[PDB]
Design a protein around this motif. Sequence first.
Motif, PDB file in Angstrom:
ATOM      1  N   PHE A   5       0.833  -1.198   0.000  1.00  0.00           N
ATOM      2  CA  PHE A   5       0.000   0.000   0.000  1.00  0.00           C
ATOM      3  C   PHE A   5       0.871   1.252   0.000  1.00  0.00           C
ATOM      4  CE2 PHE A   5      -4.255  -1.437   0.150  1.00  0.00           C
ATOM      5  CZ  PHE A   5      -4.166  -2.744   0.646  1.00  0.00           C
ATOM      6  N   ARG A   6       0.465   2.251  -0.776  1.00  0.00           N
ATOM      7  CA  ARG A   6       1.220   3.492  -0.852  1.00  0.00           C
ATOM      8  C   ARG A   6       1.076   4.286   0.444  1.00  0.00           C
ATOM      9  NH1 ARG A   6       1.351   7.153  -6.302  1.00  0.00           N
ATOM     10  NH2 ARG A   6       3.253   6.305  -7.182  1.00  0.00           N
ATOM     11  N   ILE A  12       3.921  -0.902   2.230  1.00  0.00           N
ATOM     12  CA  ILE A  12       3.635  -1.989   3.166  1.00  0.00           C
ATOM     13  C   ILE A  12       2.303  -2.657   2.840  1.00  0.00           C
ATOM     14  CG2 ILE A  12       4.211  -2.471   5.548  1.00  0.00           C
ATOM     15  CD1 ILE A  12       4.462   0.316   6.133  1.00  0.00           C
ATOM     16  N   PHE A  13       2.136  -3.886   3.320  1.00  0.00           N
ATOM     17  CA  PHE A  13       0.914  -4.634   3.089  1.00  0.00           C
ATOM     18  C   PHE A  13      -0.088  -4.376   4.210  1.00  0.00           C
ATOM     19  CE2 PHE A  13       4.144  -6.987   5.333  1.00  0.00           C
ATOM     20  CZ  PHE A  13       5.242  -6.773   4.491  1.00  0.00           C
TER      21      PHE A  13
END
Length: 16
Positions: A5-6, A12-13
């Motif tokens: 994810f931005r 990161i997830f």
Amino acid sequence: GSRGFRFXPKIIFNER
């Protein structure tokens, strides 16, 4: 699900 994810100058997830 997703695999990254931005979030700022980093990736990161979060959500499955």
